[PDB]
């Protein structure tokens with residue numbers, strides 16, 4: 323669980339996140355670094371190269387929704403399973419996403435935060451964010467459990 | 468979530484499973500096939516060769532307990548998570564076993580049943596057992612969820 | 613990465629499979645489709661019923677790729693280059709599916725090789741299928 | 754398995770790290786111990802406090818090993834064989850831990866090299882770290 327001081331450091335950094343960029347950068351990096359994930363997103367059009375992925379407006383728009391779900395998680399850290407229940411049904415029952423991929427996206431988001439925040443993304447701040455993304459990944463996978 | 472026909476198939480095969488040996492065979496094969504798992508069993512003595520592992524009396528005795536746990540799950544298919552609560556806390560909270568290793572041991576066990584049962588271990592009988600070993604592994608990993 | 617002993621074991625075990633390689637490839641696929649039904653989403657055209665000619669045919673192609681990998685164990689990226697392109701670049705198969713098929717191939721070998729599926733052979737074959745899987749899930753050309 | 758572009762990307766990115774290699778290795782270890790405390794089970798007798806000289810010295814060793822792996826990307830089983838001995842044969846490190854360290858190394862690089870840590874470079878470094886991890890977790894001699 324996040325301690326009070328962890329929750330504080332998390333919310334302070336999250337307040338500074340560029341809401342139009344960070345989500346699409348995380349989703350884009352997922353598709354580039356773990357290319358099998360592109361099979362779920364073929365309908366988004368051209369994902370044929372790193373630059374195509376990162377310049378794809380559907381990736382950018384979808385990434386903004388993903389970021390919004392993370393924001394929703396951050397506002398409900400004591401009830402992630404309830405917050406993500408319908409999303410879990412989508413991702414597990416309908417899409418059959420392997421749950422490892424939820425963990426991969428969480429870790430890519432952590433990489434994007436480090437990228438944006440540099441030295442401000444300290445090891446303790448990272449540790450707090452790892453609890454967050456682990457909780458979100460677990461909540462998404464709830465319908466497999 | 469096994470069909471009634473899957474339940475009778477699972478039950479019929481399990482009634483022929485030798486309680487003294489199949490668990491030891493599965494644990495032994497885990498230690499041989501996936502050598503990092505040996506780190507959890509330093510107190511068992513000589514694991515230097517496949518023959519040392521498969522003849523090791525502590526592997527056999529421990530494997531009997533592992534097999535007894537599977538027997539327990541089979542008797543409580545509608546509540547694997549409760550059946551395995553105490554073991555989940557041991558494996559996750561105390562030993563910090565990576566949950567993928569739970570899946571590996573379940574799959575080794577399936578390989579052991581196949582070896583023993585040959586033609587009887589048909590694809591549909593495997594499919595039923597796969598639901599069982601997935602449910603056991605998921606239950607053992609509950610304390611990470 | 614395979615040891616000398618692993619390579620010996622794999623060549624010996626696959627030798628024991630011999631002319632049944634295609635049959636075993638097909639059975640492994642059948643086991644996979646029944647156990648892990650989401651894998652069927654990769655073969656929707658196919659008749660996936662028990663005794664299917666399409667599964668029989670595919671199983672032979674899989675088996676022949678494995679025979680090729682065994683014969684070129686020290687040259688796998690080269691030997692499997694077109695299969696890597698297909699699985700990693702064109703089809704984008706989720707690597708988890710390779711774990712599923714590899715498991716089902718081991719189960720199939722265990723069921724058919726009661727006298728030869730020793731713990732060491734098991735170990736070596738598991739490593740071999742991980743090595744194959746790694747090549748087929750990598751884009752390296 | 755790395756493409757030519759992956760090899761180029763890795764050599765270029767690690768070349769940029771240069772003299773920071775040990776500092777960044779130590780930072781990655783610290784990130785790992787704080788984020789994933791179960792990893793401290795491998796270092797039970799170490800001082801793992803912030804600023805630890807032992808973590809600094811270990812970070813340098815890890816970093817130098819990576820430099821060697823980058824130089825010998827096409828000869829890694831040979832180049833890294835003593836480290837395979839150490840990690841696979843002696844310590845028997847569970848492979849999941851390699852994912853965790855690899856992740857922490859990527860975070861470290863992202864935090865320090867914003868211009869160099871492009872999606873392509875991130876992808877190539879992830880594959881390289883997977884290849885290193887596979888050698889270090891395999892018993893092949």
Ligand code: HEM
Nearest residue numbers: 359362363387388391392419423424425427428458459462
């Ligand atoms: C782990 C954190 C993740 C979060 C928080 C997340 C969140 C979301 C959200 C908010 C939506 C939109 C739902 C809607 O419009 O009603 C969605 C859709 C989707 N997600 Fe995820 N997701 C995650 C992981 C993944 C992963 C790993 C994959 C695939 C590899 C994936 C594939 C999809 C797909 C295919 C859709 C439908 C997109 C479309 O075509 O419009 N998601 N996700």
Ligand code: HEM
Nearest residue numbers: 504507532533536537554562564568569570572573604607
């Ligand atoms: C997936 C199925 C597994 C089952 C059903 C299972 C079952 C059990 C049982 C019944 C016990 C004995 C509990 C007692 O005596 O109170 C036990 C202990 C233990 N298990 Fe497992 N286990 C599983 C997987 C694993 C794996 C994958 C590992 C490690 C890689 C592991 C490591 C251990 C250890 C170290 C102990 C304690 C041994 C001792 O100190 O004597 N288990 N397990």
Ligand code: HEM
Nearest residue numbers: 651654655673674677678695699703705709710713744748
């Ligand atoms: C040991 C692992 C594997 C081997 C050796 C293997 C080998 C092959 C071969 C030889 C082909 C035929 C290529 C041709 O006709 O030119 C093929 C096609 C294919 N493979 Fe695999 N494969 C493996 C794993 C997988 C997995 C895990 C999946 C998905 C679950 C998969 C999905 C397919 C699909 C969809 C095709 C194309 C089928 C078609 O168009 O007929 N393969 N594979």
Ligand code: HEM
Nearest residue numbers: 792795796814815818819836840844846850851854885889
């Ligand atoms: C990129 C991956 C890795 C590389 C390149 C690497 C490299 C090294 C090197 C060079 C040493 C020798 C240190 C010396 O001589 O002082 C070493 C030792 C060690 N490594 Fe790793 N390592 C890696 C991953 C891991 C992981 C994932 C773990 C466990 C979480 C681990 C645990 C250890 C331990 C416990 C030692 C011995 C430390 C001591 O007691 O002095 N390594 N590693």
Ligand SMILES: O=C(CSc1nnc(-c2c[nH]c3ccccc23)o1)Nc1ccc(C(=O)O)cc1
Nearest residue numbers: 613614685686743829830831884887888893894
């Ligand atoms: O085992 C094989 C062929 S099958 C296979 N599986 N993984 C690899 C592999 C080769 N280079 C890699 C780089 C990083 C990750 C894995 C690999 O190869 N080759 C092989 C075995 C032993 C040695 C030696 O003792 O020096 C050299 C070569």
Ligand SMILES: O=C(CSc1nnc(-c2c[nH]c3ccccc23)o1)Nc1ccc(C(=O)O)cc1
Nearest residue numbers: 688689690743746747752753754755826827884
């Ligand atoms: O990428 C590297 C060096 S780093 C690495 N990672 N995995 C392997 C690897 C080598 N042989 C294996 C056998 C089975 C599983 C994996 C491996 O190697 N070598 C490499 C790259 C491309 C080719 C080609 O285009 O023919 C050949 C070789």
